[PDB]
Structures are given as C-alpha cells and as structure tokens.
C-alpha cells in the first residue's frame, strides 16, 4: 500500500524484535538452506575443536579457534538476520492490513429492496448466497457484487485512495470489498466470499505465506549455489592429505574457515531476504500478487494488452450529446433511448435515462415492470433493448444495429454514417438506436482518460514493451482514444473470442504477453494471459482470474511490476556474481596464510602484505561476516534498475558487481587486518 | 623467439580455420541428417544389410545405444587383451596382459582417454594393437561426435521428442569422416617416415658394434586416427615424439591440425546448423583467446627454462630437457597446450621435465574440463555447459528469463548442467586425495617434493578429464593405480555423457522463442568475454588450492 507507508528498513524497533527471532533461528532447523547449513556445521565443528583445545588436545591456540568459531556463528546470525528482517517487514505490513476485520453487524434481508428485514448477524457468519444492506456511512462486512442501487465508496482503508470509488449495480463497477466506507446513500450487495477466502485473506496469503513457495529461478540459483558449495567443499576437504604429504598438515579450523570463506555465503544468506523483500516492495506498489513466480515471469514481457473502457478510461461514460437523424425528432430519439435504457443496469444505460429525462424535461413515467419484456446486454451480441410492445426498440454498436436492420429489411443511411464518424472523430462512443427497422439516431458517449498516462506509455516504449489497446468500440473512436492516450497500436471491433484469439496468436509466437483488464468480459482472456494485472475497480471474476490485482487502478502498473520483478532477478544475479568473484581475494589472503609452515615459499602470493597467517585468516572470516551486513540494504531495497539495452545493462552489471567482487574484498581484508594490527589483537 | 612463436601460433590457427570450415559444412550436413553427396544408395544398401532402418530415437534410447556400443567394445577389447597370446600377429610371442593392466587400458581406449601405463613395444602384439586400441580409437571418437550431434540436434529441433538414429550417426561418422581423412593422414605419415608394416623386430648391428632391436608394426594407421579423434596412444612408450610416430616437423604440424580439426569443425557445424554463424564464432573466439594466452604463457616459461642450466656451464637456460631436437621448445610448448586443452593426450615432450608454469598451465587446462578446443565432441558439450551457466547468470543480471538460442533454460537444465559439471572435479579431488592417503599411490612418484604431488594430480586430472597424457614419471602400473584411474576415466566420461543426453532430451521438447528487442545476444565481444571469464574463474577457484601445493610451490621454491 502507498498510504500508511512503510518506514525505513531499520526503524530500531523491529531490529531488536527480529534479532530475538534470529537467536531462535540458530538450531538445527536450517535443513532447507544448504549453504548456511554447511556454515552451521563448520561453526559447530570449530566450536567443538576450540572446546577440545581449551580442555586439552593435541594442537594449540584455543583463542584462534574460538575467534574463528565466534565469527562463523556471527556469520550465521547475520545471514539469518537479513532473512528475519525481510520476513518481519512483511509481517509488519501484514499486521498493518490485518486489522481490517472490525465489524460484527450485517443485515439479513429476504429480498433485495430498500429494506426488507433488518435482522442483524455477526459478519463472520456471512456465507455465499446472502445479501446485506449498508447505509451511508457504514462499513462493508463482506466482499461481493452489488445487486441493486449505486453508492460512492471510499476504499481508503484498503487501497489508500483518498478519492472515493463509485460502485453501481450492474456493469463492471459492481464488485465491492470489505473495510471500505459508503459515502453517498443506501447500497444492497451480495455475499460472494466464504469465511477464509476474502480479499484481505488473499492479501495476508500474499504477504504472510508461512510456506512461501520458491520461484523456479530461485530454485535453479539454489542448485548452482549447492554445486559451488560442493566443489569448494571438495577442494577444501582434500587439502588435508595434500598438506600431509607436504609436511605438517593444515589445521581443521583453518580448513573450516577457508571453506566458509569460499562457498557463496553472501547470496546463500540473502536469497530468501531478496524474495521476501520483493514481496514487500510488490505490495508497497499497491499490487496484490499471488505468486512470486508470476512476478518474476512478468519481467520478460514484451507486449502489454489493455482494455479501453474499464482500464484506460474511468468507465463513467456520460451520454453528453443528442444527435438526431433525418425525419427524426429529439423527442422520438430520447423516448427510444429511455425505453431501451429502462431496465439496463450498465453505467451507460443508466446515464442515458438519468440525463435525458432531465434534459428534455419529459419522461415516459411507467416503469419497465408494467407489461415487462426486456433483453439484457450480452457482449458477443453487443446489442440490447426492449420489446415490451409488439414494436421493438434496440440500441447498440454500429455493426450490431447494421446487422439488425439488414436482418429486418431496411438500411442504415449515409447521413447516419456521417454523424457516426463525426462523433467518432470527436471521440465519443456512438450507440445507434433503432425502432422497427428505422435508425432514429446516435448518442454521444463522452469518456475521460485516466490522467496523464502518455508519459507512462512512453516509459513502456522505452522499456521495450509495445502496448496495444484491446476494445470493442468502432475503428475510429478507438483510434481517437489511442491518439489521446499515446499508445502504440490498437485493435477495435473485437469480440472477446477474437481477443482470446489474439492472446493465443501473440502467445504461440513465443512472446510472453501481459494483459490488464477489469471486467468479467475480459476474465477468461486475463486467465489465458501469462501476466494478468487486474483492477480493483473492476469485477471479482476478473480479480480471481488475474494472478495479480492492482489497487490504484492504473493502466500502466505493469511498469512497477516489471521494476520489482527485474529487481529480484538482477539482485539475485548480481549478488551471485559478487559472491563467486569475492573468492579471489579470499584465496590470496588464506592460501599464503594456510600454507605458511608447510611451504614457507608461498608467502610471495601474499600480495596484500597481511601481518600474520592467523590475522589473515581471521580478517578473511571477519570480512565474510561483515559483507552480509553491508549488503542487507541492497537485498532489502533491490538493485538500481534503469531501462537500458540488454547488452549494455549486462555490461554495466558485469562492470559494477564483478569489479566490486574483485577489488572490494582486497580493500576490505586489508583494512580489517590493518585495524586488527593497530588494535593489537594479532 | 617471440616473433617466431607469434608466427607459429598465427600460421597454425589460420591453416586450422581454413581446413576446418569445409569440414564444418560437412559435419553440419550430418547434423541436419542430410546424406553426403555420393553416399546416397551406398547408405541404402548398407543400412538395410546391417538392420538399421533409420528410425528416430529418444534421448534414453540414444544414450542406451551409445552405452551398449561402448560396453560391447569394452568387453571385446578386454578379452582381446587378456587373450593376446592366443591371437595371430604376435611376432614376439608377448604374453597376455594382467587383469588390472588389461582392464585399465580397455577402459582407457573405450572412454576415449587412451591412458597407457605400460610400454607398448614390449607389451602389445600387432593384433591387439591394430584390431584393438584402433577400433576403439575410431569408436570412442564416433561416440563423442554422436553425443554432440544429439546436443546440436536438440538445440536446432523445435517441440519434437526424438534425436535421430545413433547407429546411423555412428556409421556415417566412422565411414565418411574418420576413415577417409585418417587414410590420407596415415599415407602422409608413411611418406614422411612413420612405420606401417607387420614385420618382426629388426635387429641392428650398430656403427660402434652394439646391438639394438628396432620394433616394427602398423604405427601410422593408428597415429592418424589418434590425431584425428583426439586420442592418446602410440605404438611405443613415447606417445608422440618417437621418430617412427612423429618423424618430421611437417608431420607434427599435420598432427596438431588433425587434433584441432574436428573440435573446430564442430563449432563451425554448430554455427551453420543454428543458422547464425555468430553462434559458432563466439565459441571459437572464446576458445582461441584462452588458447593463445596459454600457448604464450607456456612458450615464455619454457624459453626462460631451467635457471640452473646457465650456472652449470651450458650455453643457454632454455629448457631442452625432455624435448626432441627435431622440434623446438616453442613447438613443444604449442603441442603441449594443444593436446592438454584438446583432451588428446599425445606428448611431443615429457611434461614432467617441463618448468613449473609450463606444467601448471597444461594441468589447469585439463582441470577446467577440456573446453578449449576440447575433446572430440566432448569439448563442445563440455563448453556447452559453461555456456548454459553464462546465459543463466547473464539472464539473471539482465532480469530476463535465462535463454540460449531461443530455448528457455529452466530448473531441470540447471540440475543436469550442475550434475554434469560436478563429475570431473569431484573425481580429480577424490582420486588425488585417495592416492595421497594410500602408500600404493604415493610410492609411484619419481620426483620428490611438491612435484610428486604434481605428478599424482596430473595423472588423476588426465584420467578424469579423458586426456590420457601423463608426466610418465609416475609408476602407474600398480593394480591400485590401474583400478583407480580406470574408475576415474569411466565415471569421467559416462557421468558426463548421460546428463548431456538428458539435457538434450529435455531440450527437444521445448520451442525456440524468436529474437526480440530485449533478448540478450549470445555473441559479440561482451558475451565472449563473459563466457571466458566464467570458464577461467570456475576452473581457477576449483583448483587453486590443488595447484598452489604443486607447480606454484615448485615455482616459488
């Protein structure tokens, strides 16, 4: 969530409250981290060896073994500290969004009315198939669709938006969630969530996964870290017979110190911290993403698919203007529109009557229920209307009414075509109305674009994602909307099966596409798409179909999704490169130090001019401990991602992180050894 | 001397690329399952007569075919070496080999290592030297090229499940690449002075009056195929550098060209089959930069040579010890780097008598897994694991899904790639540790100090990495050494062939994503340097603790 913003990574309270848990991550329940389990077993072995020297054993220098064991334990504490810090930041967000379950009141109406039965029930007793009534000011006790009535809803407690979100019965603005506050008037909603599968429970399942699933990239990186651990363990453990033939063999504690300094302890300790911090940053960008696998798979998106009515535009779509045709009066046009829009629950159909009756100041006062015969809006039919009398009234798109009038016997006039493409050039969506194979006229449906998103679409162009606009409007109205929004291309006059066909076409080409939608109409297309950024303002069906749902309802939130996904992958690869690159200075510090009595001629490899073998090995272990702490902020923040070319960005990452892993451990080991020599412990 | 060395490297690489590009096209035609021109009809008669119906095989069936051929060859070769006293072409009536020696050389010549812990001219008869140890020289090379054919087919085929016919691949390779080229190579070697006969050993009344017994035998016919198929061997105790095996400098140059011929033509064939020549030129550049750097380092080390030679009254400090006068130290260094980077194993010179750096760099070149124009087939599918590591790391640091040649590289590929890479360093370190912990392995040394450990580590590295070259100061004729090196050679080949075949069978089922704007190009100087850095860094950090107690300690002593 954006508002109620998370504090710094170290607010000096959760540091203590999680280091207390880090002290409880010490025992043998580290079996799931092999790189850290190797360090744990080596630290226990060095502790037992130091205890043996303290109580009487063959070798000496119990203080050196004690210091090595203590610093290996400190390495384990630091690598658990990063993981517990990320996990406790996630738990802090979970506790922030966990107090939403407040109310214990819910009305039980037998029929959806203004009011039927005010039987109060606890909100935990609500199950699927029930209806409630929320007044103007009350909070929502469940998540579900709206049956009757509309009301302005303040979703600040969930999304952070101070601006209220309009919810209206029917259409794509019917889903409402709990914790939000009604600000306008009465509202009757349905109960569509059972206890245990609400939107807040989805949020808690995202942020507080007790068995948090590992992404395939994380598992493959873990496999490579295990392989590096195996080769370093063998190359370190076989050093004892080699030095035994050389003379006096190397001590076991020096071998364990070299083993810990060689294996990738850094990335092996910060991997889970990277994943959990990626979830925390993902929720901090107002996205409720079910799977980190989906988050990381969103990083290679090259084509983004957008809805137009519910995603790029707000979806109010007021019927601003009146346009009559030849031989048609505005009274007849308004009457046909009002009769066609009596029982329509779409926002456009409601807007038709609720402005047209006030504009013309005349109203056909009967309700639709008197001699009722009404047909709903189906998206593939793309046409609706009323046929209460023997005469018929229908409204819909140009293609729908044209097919209807060729079926009836008439024809659509060229004057009507001139008015249609004139209002399409103006930008309003035209709905053609018909009565008895007579085209009365069109209605201008003015719609508003969701702010200045042209800069975000230019950012998407710069990042390499080509965005197209999927809609069902005319070819020219969608062209005007695309010109206003600054998108790359569009596909107009598309039935949802054609949208799904376009998804299959772009997916069979090998491209991994992303789709952003809000409505139930686009729900199977979102479920088919690889990355499906649903909208909170949309429908519960689209929210369930999408693998990640927004809360700010931004059309270009895939920018942030790709940001955190590529930050995860780049942080993993960069810390891996740093960890393998670090071993050169560890070799240059330990090998002339470990082989100093068996082979005294190997001191020429001591290019850092370290004081003594014990100081060199102990300084290497100290740097191996401290690099984890110095890279906790990078693991918890992610690396700095800029929209560069793939080759140039790889070159930048190689330069920065490879040269850091080469030169930085030299400087760190030399500074630590110099500080130790100055202090006098070595 | 530096100008002569640079001219030698440049001439060798230029003639190598010129000779290897048409063979690259020819091998690409066999990868694409297109018969060679003029071989149509003969194939139809021969495959039908044998019982090979050109049915396509999965990775499991392909791998079982390769393993069955190799086990049949192992059994035939082992029983032939045990019963060599009962076979013809024995003009010296040499007895049958012991069980340990016979098992070791059978595993050597089947697993393409061709390690030899005996003296050939006093151990092996003409039948066991020609119908054995040369048939396997053809067969192990053909098996390696068949496995890399399966891997390149896996990279070029989309969404299928089969990998072609292993028997068709082996027959095509042996009859149309391995035989007609090695026939010309053997004929040139006979012209230059190599032996090819079946005469008994020729007694010589020397000029002074002493008597020496010259050994005869079919030398050039085996020499051509051990150079073509990157095999070790030799009729005699000296693998190369025997006058009856490597008579002239032209013969030595042709030997080096034949050693790098098929491993370079395989990169050319891979680049042609993929449709992008940059995909093969990347591998060739990545091999060549490391090869040139290693050749220069070994050349400089051998030119600096023995520091005590000038003190003890000689003319120069050039390390002429253990090298032939018919070549130079420059040519000896180049041949040593060629055979220790190519998993060949033939020695122009006793590597035991090399300097510390000039013994370290060949040893390290074996230890990195033989990827620098490596073993025949095996070099390409060994560097095709470091390429998978490089594309995984680069895909992570660009934020994209890891991807090579369009196909994704997921968890199963990483698991099998790690398992394939782990086999040779694990065997090297365990074999060296077991030889260091055992007096039967420790007592085979000849040179004291760190260099005996260098001998042990070189022997175990060459066995595990299928090189076969030796310092030859190690008395590896012990039963313990024979069994240890046999286990190392066997696991080091057949624990890499199996997971590469599993990688191929999991990669055939994938599809090739087309090139996009954000896809990382797997060619160019950036990726060549990235793959070079990955190879050198992995091969360093695995073996610096092992190399710092041997040749490094000897150099700093």
């Amino acid at each position: 969530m954006s508002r109620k913003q998370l504090a710094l990574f170290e607010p000096t309270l959760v540091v203590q409250a999680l280091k207390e848990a880090v002290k409880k991550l010490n025992p043998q329940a580290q079996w799931r981290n092999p790189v850290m389990f190797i360090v744990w077993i080596g630290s226990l072995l060095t502790t037992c060896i130091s205890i043996a020297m303290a109580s009487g054993a063959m070798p000496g220098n119990a203080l050196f073994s004690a210091a090595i064991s203590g610093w290996l334990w400190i390495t384990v504490l630091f690598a658990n500290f990063a993981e517990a810090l990320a996990e406790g930041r996630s738990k802090a967000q979970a506790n922030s969004l966990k107090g939403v379950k407040k109310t214990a009141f819910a009305r039980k109406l037998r029929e959806p009315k203004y009011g039927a039965a005010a039987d109060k029930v606890p909100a935990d007793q609500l199950r699927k198939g029930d209806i409630v009534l929320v007044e103007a000011g009350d909070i929502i006790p469940c998540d579900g669709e709206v049956i009757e009535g509309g009301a302005s809803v303040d979703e600040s407690a969930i999304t952070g938006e101070a601006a209220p979100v309009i919810r209206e019965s029917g259409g794509d603005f019917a889903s409402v969630t709990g914790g939000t506050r009604i600000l306008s008037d009465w509202l009757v909603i349905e109960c569509s969530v059972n206890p245990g599968e609400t939107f807040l429970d989805r949020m808690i399942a995202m942020v507080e996964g007790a068995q948090r699933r590992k992404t395939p990239n994380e598992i493959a990186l873990t496999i490579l870290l295990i392989a590096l651990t195996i080769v370093f363990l063998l190359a370190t453990a076989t050093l004892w017979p080699f030095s035994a033939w050389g003379g006096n063999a190397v001590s076991v504690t020096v071998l364990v110190a070299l083993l810990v300094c060689l294996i990738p302890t850094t990335i092996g300790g910060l991997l889970s911290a990277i994943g959990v911090a990626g979830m925390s940053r993902m929720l901090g960008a107002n996205v409720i993403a079910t799977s980190g696998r989906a988050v990381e798979a969103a990083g290679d998106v090259d084509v983004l698919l957008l809805d137009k009515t519910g995603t790029i535009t707000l979806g109010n779509r007021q019927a601003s203007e009146f346009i009559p045709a030849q031989g048609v009066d505005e009274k007849t046009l308004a009457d046909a529109a009002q009769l066609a829009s009596l029982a329509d629950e779409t926002p456009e159909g409601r807007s038709i009557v609720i402005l047209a009756k006030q504009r013309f100041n005349l109203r056909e006062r009967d309700v639709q229920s008197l001699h009722a015969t009404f047909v709903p809006f189906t998206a593939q039919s793309r046409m609706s209307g009323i046929n209460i009398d023997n005469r018929m009234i229908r409204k819909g798109s140009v293609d729908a009414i044209r097919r209807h009038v060729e079926a009836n016997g008439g024809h659509f006039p060229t004057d009507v075509d001139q008015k249609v493409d004139q209002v399409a050039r103006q930008g309003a969506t035209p709905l053609v109305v018909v009565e008895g194979s007579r085209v009365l006229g069109v209605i201008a449906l003015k719609d508003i674009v969701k702010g200045g998103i042209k800069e975000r679409f230019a950012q998407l162009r710069k990042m390499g994602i080509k965005t197209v606009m999927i809609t069902g409007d005319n070819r020219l109205t969608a062209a005007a909307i695309a010109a206003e929004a600054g998108v790359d291309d569009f596909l107009a006059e598309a039935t949802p099966e054609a949208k799904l066909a376009l998804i299959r076409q772009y997916q069979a080409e090998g491209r991994l596409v992303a789709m952003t939608g809000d409505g139930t109409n686009d729900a199977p297309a979102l479920a088919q798409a690889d990355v499906a950024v649903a909208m909170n303002s949309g429908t519960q069906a689209a929210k369930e179909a999408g693998n990640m749902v927004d809360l700010d309802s931004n059309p270009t939130k895939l920018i942030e999704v790709v940001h955190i996904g590529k930050q995860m992958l780049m942080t993993r690869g960069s810390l891996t490169t740093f960890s393998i690159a670090n071993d050169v200075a560890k070799y240059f510090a330990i090998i002339p130090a470990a082989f100093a009595a068996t082979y005294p001629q190997l001191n020429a490899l001591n290019i850092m001019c370290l004081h003594s073998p014990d100081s060199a090995i102990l300084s290497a272990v100290i740097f191996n401990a401290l690099i984890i702490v110095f890279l906790i902020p990078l693991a918890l923040k992610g690396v700095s991602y800029k929209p560069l070319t793939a080759s140039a960005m790889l070159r930048r990452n190689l330069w920065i992180y490879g040269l850091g892993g080469l030169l930085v451990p030299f400087i760190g080991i030399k500074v630590i050894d110099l500080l130790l020599t100055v202090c006098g412990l070595v | 001397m530096a100008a002569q060395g640079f001219l030698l490297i440049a001439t060798f690489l230029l003639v190598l690329m010129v000779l290897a590009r048409p063979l690259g096209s020819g091998l690409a035609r066999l990868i694409n399952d297109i018969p060679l021109p003029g071989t149509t009809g003969v194939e139809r008669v021969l495959f039908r007569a044998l019982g090979v119906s050109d049915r396509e095989m999965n990775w499991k069936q392909y791998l079982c075919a390769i393993l069955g051929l190799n086990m049949l060859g192992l059994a035939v070769l082992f029983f032939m070496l045990l019963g060599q006293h009962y076979l013809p072409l024995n003009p010296q009536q040499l007895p049958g080999l012991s069980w340990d020696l016979a098992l070791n050389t059978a595993v050597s010549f089947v697993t393409n290592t061709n390690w030899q812990s005996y003296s050939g001219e006093t151990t092996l008869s003409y039948f066991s030297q020609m119908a054995g140890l040369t048939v396997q020289n053809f067969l192990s090379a053909a098996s390696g090229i068949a496995v890399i054919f399966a891997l390149i087919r896996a990279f070029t085929r989309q969404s299928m499940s089969t990998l072609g016919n292993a028997w068709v691949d082996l027959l095509r390779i042996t009859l149309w690449v391995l035989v007609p080229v090695a026939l010309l190579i053997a004929l040139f070697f006979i012209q230059q002075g190599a032996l090819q006969n079946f005469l008994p050993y020729q007694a010589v009344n020397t000029v002074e009056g002493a008597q020496q017994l010259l050994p005869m035998g079919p030398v050039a016919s085996q020499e051509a195929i051990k150079m073509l198929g990157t095999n070790d061997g030799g009729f005699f105790n000296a693998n190369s550098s025997h006058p009856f095996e490597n008579p002239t400098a032209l013969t030595n140059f042709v030997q080096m060209l034949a050693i790098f011929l098929i491993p370079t033509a395989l990169c050319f064939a891979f680049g042609e089959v993929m449709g992008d020549r940059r995909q093969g030129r990347m591998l060739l550049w990545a091999m060549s930069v490391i090869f040139v750097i290693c050749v220069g380092v070994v050349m400089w080390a051998e030119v600096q040579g023995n520091p005590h030679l000038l003190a003890l009254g000689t003319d120069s400090s050039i390390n002429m010890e253990g090298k032939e006068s018919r070549f130079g130290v420059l040519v000896s260094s180049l041949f040593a780097v060629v055979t220790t980077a190519a998993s060949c194993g033939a020695v122009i010179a006793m590597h035991d008598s090399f300097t510390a750096l000039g013994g370290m760099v060949p040893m390290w070149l074996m230890q990195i897994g033989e990827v620098v124009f490596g073993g025949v087939g095996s070099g390409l599918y060994g560097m095709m694991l470091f390429v998978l590591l490089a594309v995984f790391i680069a895909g992570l640091m660009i934020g994209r899904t890891p991807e090579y040649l369009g196909k994704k590289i997921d968890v199963r590929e990483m698991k099998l790639t790690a398992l394939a890479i782990l086999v040779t360093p694990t065997l090297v370190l365990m074999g060296a540790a077991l030889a260091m912990m055992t007096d039967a392995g420790r007592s085979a040394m000849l040179n004291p100090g760190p260099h005996g450990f260098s001998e042990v580590l070189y022997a175990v590295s060459s066995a595990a990495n299928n090189n076969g070259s030796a310092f030859a100061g190690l008395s590896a004729n012990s039963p313990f050494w024979n069994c240890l090196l046999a286990f190392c050679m066997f696991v080091g080949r057949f624990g890499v062939i199996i997971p590469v075949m599993a990688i191929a069978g999991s990669l055939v089922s994938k599809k090739s994503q087309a090139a996009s704007s954000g896809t990382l190009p797997t060619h160019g100087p950036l990726f060549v340097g990235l793959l070079i850095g990955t190879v050198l860094l992995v091969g360093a950090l695995t073996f610096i603790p092992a190399l710092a107690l041997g040749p490094v300690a000897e150099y700093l002593s």
Binding site: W31, R32, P34, F37, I38, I41, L45, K214, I219, T222, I223, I226, A227, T229, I230, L233, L234, A237, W240, V252 | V411, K415, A418, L419, M437
Partner: peptide, 27 residues
Amino acid sequence: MSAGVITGVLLVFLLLGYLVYALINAE
C-alpha cells in the same frame, strides 16, 4: 589411519551426500 581421519572422511561424505540430495531435490 587413526580415528580422526576416519571421522573427517565420514563427515565429508555425509556433507557431500546431504548436498547432492539438496541439489537433486527442490527443498
């Protein structure tokens, strides 16, 4: 060989077996 070398080799084989099991599995 004394007990120390046997214990060291046993520990190395146990670590290697655990690491190979971890590489094979998706823990």
